[PDB]
Structures are given as structure tokens and as C-alpha cells.
Amino acid sequence: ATGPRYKVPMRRRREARTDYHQRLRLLKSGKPRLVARKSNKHVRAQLVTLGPNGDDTLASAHSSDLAEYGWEAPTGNMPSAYLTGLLAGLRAQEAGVEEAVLDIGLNSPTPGSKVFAIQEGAIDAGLDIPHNDDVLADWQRTRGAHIAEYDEQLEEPLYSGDFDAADLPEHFDELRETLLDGDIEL
């Protein structure tokens, strides 16, 4: 920018999107990566491999195409993340993928976080991933119990119209139950 000698960072570093030092360590395993990504409203989960002209996604799942299986609840929560993980994990298995390492991009390794929920899901789908159980949420929170109890302190529906008034961690089970047998795109 300033001169001939000026050093312009890599595009993905300018965009503040890729952490290249972590990327390298991640690529060390030689295994596919389980890209765990979030949005204000959604949660994405991809299984990326290395390629000649860039990464190759062999299997993915988005919290949106979750409804495609009977989801009638918000998609930017814990139960959502887990399921998207399990959904991507399954598609992953279908694709012949057996193991991967957790890439959480620029997110933070906070215990019980949605990225780890994503990881728990993918693992339960059958994917073999290097993990640590006590950094994961305690199942109930994954089910969405923390939100149901939060609506207990109601007075006003936590969900604007949406579905239910007291919410449903049960709707969570019905879905995980669904994903664990047959159905299309899995």
C-alpha cells in the first residue's frame, strides 16, 4: 500500500477469517477437519479435506435444513448445534468419512459451547474425533433444558409466536431419534 517494500497480509488474514497458525497445526493430523461455524441465527458443520486448488467439503449440515426433518424451533441454540453436528456427521459417514479433527476457526474453546456441541453430535453420528468429554455441556443443556427453565421465569413467552410457550427439549429428542435411522439425505 505505502510502498514497494510494504507487506500485505494474506487475503484470509486481512478478512480476519482464517487463523493460519492454527490452520497449520490443524492440517498436521492429516485428517479431515470438522469445521464448526456459527451465525447469529444459524450453525454450520462441514467436513473439509485438503485440495490442489483449495479445500474440498465432502459433507456438510446447516441448522436451517434441520427443519427439513421436523425442526420447528429456533436454530441458533445448543440443541440446534448438536443436531447439525450429528446430521453433518451422518452424511459424513455416508461419504466414507471415518475420522476428523475439530476446527473451531476464530471461536473460543469455552466449555459447553455450541462448537463442542457440534463436536459431540458429529462423534455420536459415528465420526472418530480427538476430544475431551468434560469440556462438553452436560446433555441436559444440549437438550435445551437451560432454555426451558429460562421460560419458566416466563410472564412473557421467550419465543415470539414461534412454537410452544414453555418450549420443548423433548422436540430435541424426537429429532435426534429421527436422525438415528433411515430417512433421505443421510
Residues that bind another protein (CB under 8 A): 4-10, 15-17, 20-21, 23-24, 27-28, 50, 105-108
CB of 107 to Cl ion, least distance (A): 5
Distance CA 167, CA 151 (A): 7
59-88 positions binding RNA, by CB under 7 A: 60, 62, 64-65, 73-74, 76-78
Q: Stretches 11-19, 103-111, 168-176, 177-185: which one binds Cl ion (CB under 5 A)?
A: 103-111
Query: Quick one: which segment of 65-73, 77-85, 105-113, 125-133 binds Cl ion (CB under 5 A)?
Result: 105-113
With binding defined as CB under 5 A, does residue 37 bind Cl ion?
A: yes
Query: How many chain residues bind RNA (CB under 7 A)?
Result: 84
- Decide whether 41 or 180 has the Cβ nearer to RNA: 41
Name the one range near RNA by CB under 7 A: 23-31, 120-128, 174-182.
Answer: 23-31
CA 33 vs CA 2, 26, 137, 156, 165: distances in Å: 37, 8, 21, 42, 38
Query: What residues have CB less than 8 Å from 179, skipping those under 6 apart?
Result: 69, 83, 86, 87, 90, 186
Rounded CA-CA distance 148/133 in Å is 24
Contact 59, 95 (CB under 8 A): yes
Q: What stretches of the chain show up as alpha helix (H) in DSSP?
A: 11-14, 20-27, 78-94, 114-124, 140-143, 145-152, 169-179
Q: Which of 92, 123, 137, 175 contacts RNA by CB under 7 A? A: 137
177's contact among RNA, another protein, Cl ion, none, with CB below 5 to 8 A by partner kind, is: none
